[PDB]
Amino acid sequence: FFDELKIDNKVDIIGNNVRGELPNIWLQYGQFKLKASGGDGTYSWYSENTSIATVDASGKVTLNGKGSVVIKATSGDKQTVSYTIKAPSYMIKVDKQAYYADAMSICKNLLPSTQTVLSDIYDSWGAANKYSHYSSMNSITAWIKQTSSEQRSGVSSTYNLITQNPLPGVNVNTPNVYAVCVE
Amino acid sequence: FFDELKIDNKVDIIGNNVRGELPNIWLQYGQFKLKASGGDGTYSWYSENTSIATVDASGKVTLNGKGSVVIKATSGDKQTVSYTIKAPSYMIKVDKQAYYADAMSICKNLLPSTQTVLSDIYDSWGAANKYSHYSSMNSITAWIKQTSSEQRSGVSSTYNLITQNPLPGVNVNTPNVYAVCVE
Amino acid sequence: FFDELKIDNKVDIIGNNVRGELPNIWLQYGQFKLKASGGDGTYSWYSENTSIATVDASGKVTLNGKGSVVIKATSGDKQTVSYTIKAPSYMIKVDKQAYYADAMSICKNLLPSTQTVLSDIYDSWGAANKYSHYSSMNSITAWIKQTSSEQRSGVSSTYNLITQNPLPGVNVNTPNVYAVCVE
Amino acid sequence: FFDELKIDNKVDIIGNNVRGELPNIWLQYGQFKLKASGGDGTYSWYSENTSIATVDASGKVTLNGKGSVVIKATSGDKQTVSYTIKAPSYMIKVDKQAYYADAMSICKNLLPSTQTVLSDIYDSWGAANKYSHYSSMNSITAWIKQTSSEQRSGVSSTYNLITQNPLPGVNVNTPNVYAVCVE
Amino acid sequence: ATETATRDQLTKEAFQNPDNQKVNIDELGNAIPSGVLKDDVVANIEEQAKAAGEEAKQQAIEN
Amino acid sequence: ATETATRDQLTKEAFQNPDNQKVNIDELGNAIPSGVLKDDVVANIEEQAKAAGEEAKQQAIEN
Amino acid sequence: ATETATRDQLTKEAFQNPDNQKVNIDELGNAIPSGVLKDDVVANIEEQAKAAGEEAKQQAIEN
Amino acid sequence: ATETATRDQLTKEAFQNPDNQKVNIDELGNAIPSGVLKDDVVANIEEQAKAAGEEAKQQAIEN
Numbered sequence: 001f002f003d004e005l006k007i008d009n010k011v012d013i014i015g016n017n018v019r020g021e022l023p024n025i026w027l028q029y030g031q032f033k034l035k036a037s038g039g040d041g042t043y044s045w046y047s048e049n050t051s052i053a054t055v056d057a058s059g060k061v062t063l064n065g066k067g068s069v070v071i072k073a074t075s076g077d078k079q080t081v082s083y084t085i086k087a088p089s090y091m092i093k094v095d096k097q098a099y100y101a102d103a104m105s106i107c108k109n110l111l112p113s114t115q116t117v118l119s120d121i122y123d124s125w126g127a128a129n130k131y132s133h134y135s136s137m138n139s140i141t142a143w144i145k146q147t148s149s150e151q152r153s154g155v156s157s158t159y160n161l162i163t164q165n166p167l168p169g170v171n172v173n174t175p176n177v178y179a180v181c182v183e
Numbered sequence: 184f185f186d187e188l189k190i191d192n193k194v195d196i197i198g199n200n201v202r203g204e205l206p207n208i209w210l211q212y213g214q215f216k217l218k219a220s221g222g223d224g225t226y227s228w229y230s231e232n233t234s235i236a237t238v239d240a241s242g243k244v245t246l247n248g249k250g251s252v253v254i255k256a257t258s259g260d261k262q263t264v265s266y267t268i269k270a271p272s273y274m275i276k277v278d279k280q281a282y283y284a285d286a287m288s289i290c291k292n293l294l295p296s297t298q299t300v301l302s303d304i305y306d307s308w309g310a311a312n313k314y315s316h317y318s319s320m321n322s323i324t325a326w327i328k329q330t331s332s333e334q335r336s337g338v339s340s341t342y343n344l345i346t347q348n349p350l351p352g353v354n355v356n357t358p359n360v361y362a363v364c365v366e
Numbered sequence: 367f368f369d370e371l372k373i374d375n376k377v378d379i380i381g382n383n384v385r386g387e388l389p390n391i392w393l394q395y396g397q398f399k400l401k402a403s404g405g406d407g408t409y410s411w412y413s414e415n416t417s418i419a420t421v422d423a424s425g426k427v428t429l430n431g432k433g434s435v436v437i438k439a440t441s442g443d444k445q446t447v448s449y450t451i452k453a454p455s456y457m458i459k460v461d462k463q464a465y466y467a468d469a470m471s472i473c474k475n476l477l478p479s480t481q482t483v484l485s486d487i488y489d490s491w492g493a494a495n496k497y498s499h500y501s502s503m504n505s506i507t508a509w510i511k512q513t514s515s516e517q518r519s520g521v522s523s524t525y526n527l528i529t530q531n532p533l534p535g536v537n538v539n540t541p542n543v544y545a546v547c548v549e
Numbered sequence: 550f551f552d553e554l555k556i557d558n559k560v561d562i563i564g565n566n567v568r569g570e571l572p573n574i575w576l577q578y579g580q581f582k583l584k585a586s587g588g589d590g591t592y593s594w595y596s597e598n599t600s601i602a603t604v605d606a607s608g609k610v611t612l613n614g615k616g617s618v619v620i621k622a623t624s625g626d627k628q629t630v631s632y633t634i635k636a637p638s639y640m641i642k643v644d645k646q647a648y649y650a651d652a653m654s655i656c657k658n659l660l661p662s663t664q665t666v667l668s669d670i671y672d673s674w675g676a677a678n679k680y681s682h683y684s685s686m687n688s689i690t691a692w693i694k695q696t697s698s699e700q701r702s703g704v705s706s707t708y709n710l711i712t713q714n715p716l717p718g719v720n721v722n723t724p725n726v727y728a729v730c731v732e
Numbered sequence: 733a734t735e736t737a738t739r740d741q742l743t744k745e746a747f748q749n750p751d752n753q754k755v756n757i758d759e760l761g762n763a764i765p766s767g768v769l770k771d772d773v774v775a776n777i778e779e780q781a782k783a784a785g786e787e788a789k790q791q792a793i794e795n
Numbered sequence: 796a797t798e799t800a801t802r803d804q805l806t807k808e809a810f811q812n813p814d815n816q817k818v819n820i821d822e823l824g825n826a827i828p829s830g831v832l833k834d835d836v837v838a839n840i841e842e843q844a845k846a847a848g849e850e851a852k853q854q855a856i857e858n
Numbered sequence: 859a860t861e862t863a864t865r866d867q868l869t870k871e872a873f874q875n876p877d878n879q880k881v882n883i884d885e886l887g888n889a890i891p892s893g894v895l896k897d898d899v900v901a902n903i904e905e906q907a908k909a910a911g912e913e914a915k916q917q918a919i920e921n
Numbered sequence: 922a923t924e925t926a927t928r929d930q931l932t933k934e935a936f937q938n939p940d941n942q943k944v945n946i947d948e949l950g951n952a953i954p955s956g957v958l959k960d961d962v963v964a965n966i967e968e969q970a971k972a973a974g975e976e977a978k979q980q981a982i983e984n
Binding site: 737740743748749756758765 | 829
C-alpha cells in the first residue's frame with residue numbers, strides 16, 4: 001500500500017537552518033540535507049560520484065569537489081530516485097595559511113578576485129565552522145588579491161569565513177591567514 | 184474536565200535555545216520564556232513587579248531590574264499560579280560608551296572586577312544581540328577595571344558581550360567601548 | 367772764551383734713530399734726546415714741570431703726561447736756556463689689559479677711535495718696547511672700539527704697539543689685550 | 550810710506566750690528582762686512598769662488614752657497630791679502646712655500662730637524678729681512694718636520710725667520726709657509 | 733647627515749596615524765598593531781629626509 | 796641635546812614591537828593600531844634619552 | 859625636535875670657514891682659534907634650525 | 922643611526938677647545954683659525970659615535 005517515492009526539491013542548509021535550493025556558489029565541504037517521502041518508510045542515500053559529493057544515512061550532504069553529481073535515495077521497499085547536484089560557477093576551497101605572496105602562489109593565481117565573493121558564500125552557506133570539516137575552528141581569515149592601490153602599500157584586505165569581519169589594509173605578511181583558492 | 188494548572192520549572196533561554204533554570208547572574212533585559220500546562224488551553228501571563236521584570240502574551244520574559252519578582256500565569260478557565268524570579272548576585276547593565284576614565288565614573292566605581300565576570304554572563308545567557316533590546320547591534324565591548332599592572336601602561340582589557348572576543352592592553356581612551364556597570 | 371749756548375731744535379728719537387722735531391701725537395713715556403752746544407762743555411738738563419716730563423743727565427727725555435713744558439739746559443759756565451715741549455692733540459696711555467667691554471670702561475669711553483690712530487704713534491715713535499718703561503715687553507695689543515658692524519658679531523680689531531700686527535675680528539673677551547686709553 | 554795691509558779678523562754682521570767672527574751656521578745670502586787697514590788707502594775686494602760667496606766694493610759679503618772660500622783685499626798700492634771663509638755645519642736655504650707634505654719633498658727629506666735649529670740662525674744672524682735678498686719681505690715662516698706625536702694630529706710647528714714667532718700645531722696644509730731646506 | 737633625524741621623526745610622526753600602519757591578524761581574525769608602515773608612506777618619508785638633506789647642504793653652503 | 800634623537804630612534808624602535816603599542820577598538824569590537832605607546836614604555840624611553848644625554852656631556856667633557 | 863640637529867650640523871658646518879670664528883690673542887700678539895662663532899652667525903644658525911623645525915612640523919602634518 | 926648626531930655634537934663640542942683645532946698661517950706669520958680638527962681628535966670622535974651607535978642598538982633591543 002506504499003506511496004510514490006520522491007526526494008524533496010528544496011534542500012536543508014546545515015549551516016543556517018535556511019530551507020531553499022542549492023546555491024550557484026559553493027563552500028567546499030558545505031552541507032545540505034535531503035528529504036525523501038512515500039514508499040516504505042526507511043530511506044537509503046547514495047551518491048553517484050563520491051569525489052564531488054557524499055551523504056550519510058540521513059540525507060546530510062557534504063560537497064567535496066567541483067562538478068555535477070547525483071544522489072540516489074532508495075526506500076526499503078526497493079523504490080529508488082535521483083537528485084541532481086549541478087556544478088557551480090566557482091567553489092571556494094581552503095588551502096594552508098600563508099603570506100599573500102605565497103597565498104597567490106598556493107592558489108595558483110586563483111585567489112578571491114574581490115570581497116564581493118566570499119561575502120556571497122557567507123550570505124548563502126553561513127559560518128564555515130558550522131560544517132563538520134570546520135566547526136572545531138573559530139577563525140578563518142582570507143586573502144583577497146591586493147589591488148595595485150593597496151599593492152603599493154604592500155598589503156591587501158581580508159574576510160573571515162567563520163565570522164565575516166572585513167579587514168582592510170593588512171600586512172601582506174601577517175601570520176594566521178588562510179590561503180583560500182577559487183575553483 | 185480541565186487539568187491542574189502549572190508553570191513549568193525549567194525556563195527557556197531566548198538567547199541560546201538552552202533549556203534549564205534561571206541563572207544566578209543576569210544580563211539586564213535578558214529573556215527567558217515560561218511554560219504553562221493544564222486547565223483551559225489559553226494562558227495569561229503577568230508580572231507582580233513591572234520594574235524588575237516583564238512578559239508578553241507568550242511567556243517571553245525580559246528582566247529589567249535587579250530584585251525578586253513573581254510571574255502570574257492565569258488560564259482562560261480562571262486558574263492562576265505564580266513563578267518566582269529571585270534576585271541575582273549581580274546584574275550587568277549597559278550604560279553609554281566612554282573612556283575607561285569615565286567608564287569607572289559612569290558606573291560609579293562599579294565596573295566588572297575581572298574578565299571572569301562577563302564571561303559567565305555569556306556562557307549563561309549568550310550573545311547580547313540575541314535579545315530584543317539589543318539584536319539591532321553587532322558590537323558591545325566592555326571595560327574591565329585596569330589592574331595596577333596595566334594601570335601603569337595606561338590601559339585595560341575588554342570583552343565583547345555580543346562576541347566574547349577578549350582584548351588585552353587597550354587604550355584607556357579608545358572610542359567605541361561601552362561602560363558596563365555591575366549592580 | 368766760551369760760545370753762545372743753545373739747545374738744538376731737531377730732537378733725537380730714542381725709539382727709531384730718526385732725527386727730527388717732536389711729533390704732534392705722543393706715546394706716553396716716549397723718549398727723545400736733546401742736544402746742547404757752545405758755552406762751557408758740560409751741560410745740565412732739567413724740566414720745568416716734572417709730571418708732564420723728565421730728563422736724565424744726557425738729554426734723554428721721557429714724556430709722562432699731557433700738557434706743555436720746558437726743558438732747561440745749563441752749561442757748567444752758568445749759561446742756561448729752555449726748549450719748549452708743547453702739548454699734543456692726544457697722548458696714548460696704556461692702562462691694564464682687559465676685555466673690550468671693560469676696556470671701553472677702564473679708558474672712560476676713550477679708546478682709540480680707529481686703527482688710523484695707533485698706526486701714527488708707531489709710524490712716528492716706533493716700537494713701544496724700545497723705550498725704558500716698556501722694552502722688557504714683547505707684546506702690547508690694543509683695543510679699537512668696535513664699529514656697530516663688528517659690534518653685532520660681538521668683536522673688534524687690534525694693533526700691537528710693539529709690533530703693529532693688525533688683527534680684525536677679535537673676541538671682545540680674549541685675554542692678553544691691553545686697554546689703551548686716549549687723552 | 551805705506552803700512553802693512555790686513556783684513557780685520559772680526560767681521561761685521563749686516564743683520565744686527567753685532568761685531569764678532571763668522572758663525573758656524575749660516576743663513577744663505579746672509580751678509581757680513583770685512584775691514585781692511587794700512588797700505589794705500591783704497592781697498593779692492595774680490596772672492597776666490599763666486600758661487601759660495603760674493604762681496605761689493607765696501608766689504609759687504611753675501612754667502613750664496615755652502616763650502617769654503619777666500620776673499621782677497623787689494624789696496625790701491627798693490628798690496629793684497631786673503632780672508633778665509635770656512636764651510637759651516639749646515640746652511641739654511643729657502644725654497645718655495647708649500648704644504649709640509651711637499652715641504653719635506655721639496656727639501657729632499659732635509660727639513661729643519663727641530664726648532665732648536667733656525668732659532669740659532671736667528672740668534673746669530675738675526676732677522677732674515679735685514680739682508681738684501683730678503684728685506685722686501687715681512688714674513689718667512691718655516692716647516693719643522695713633524696714628530697710622530699704631532700704627526701698623528703696631522704700637523705707640525707714653525708718658526709718665522711724674519712720674526713721668530715714659534716707656532717705649535719699647524720695645519721700640515723696651511724698656505725703661506727716656506728719650505729726651508731738644510732744643507 | 734641631517735636627514736638621518738628627519739627620518740626618525742617622521743617615521744615616528746607616522747605611527748601617530750593608524751592608516752599608515754600595516755595590520756596583522758591574531759588567532760581569531762582580530763586586527764592588531766603589526767608594527768610596520770605601509771611601504772608607500774615609508775617610501776615617501778625616506779624620499780623626504782633625503783630632500784631635507786639636500787636642503788641643509790644646498791643651503792649650509794652660506795659660505 | 797643629543798638625547799633629542801636617542802628619543803626619536805627608540806620611540807620608533809618601539810613601534811616595531813606591538814606589545815608596546817596601545818590598542819584601539821573599531822565599530823565591531825575589532826582591535827586596531829591605536830597609534831600610541833604604553834605610558835610605561837614611553838616612560839622608560841624618555842628616562843633613557845635623558846641619561847644618554849648625561850652621557851655625551853659627562854663625557855663630551857674630554858677637555 | 860628636528861631643529862635640535864639642524865643646529866649641531868650648521869654649528870659645525872660653520873667652523874669650516876674661519877671668518878665665522880672669533881679670534882683670541884696669545885702671549886705675543888698672535889692670533890689663535892678662539893673657539894667661538896661670531897654672535898651674528900650663531901644668531902642666524904639658531905634662527906634657522908627653529909625655522910627648519912617649523913618645517914618638519916608644518917609639514918610632518920601630512921595627516 | 923643615532924651615531925649620526927653623537928658625531929655632530931662632539932664635533933662641535935670640540936671646536937670649543939682650541940687645542941683640538943689645527944692652525945693656519947696668514948700673510949705675516951700670524952696664527953689663525955684653520956677650520957679643522959686635529960686628525961686624532963676627529964679620529965676619536967668618529968670612533969665614539971660608532972660605539973654610541975653600538976649602544977642604542979645593543980640596547981634598543983629591549984624586546
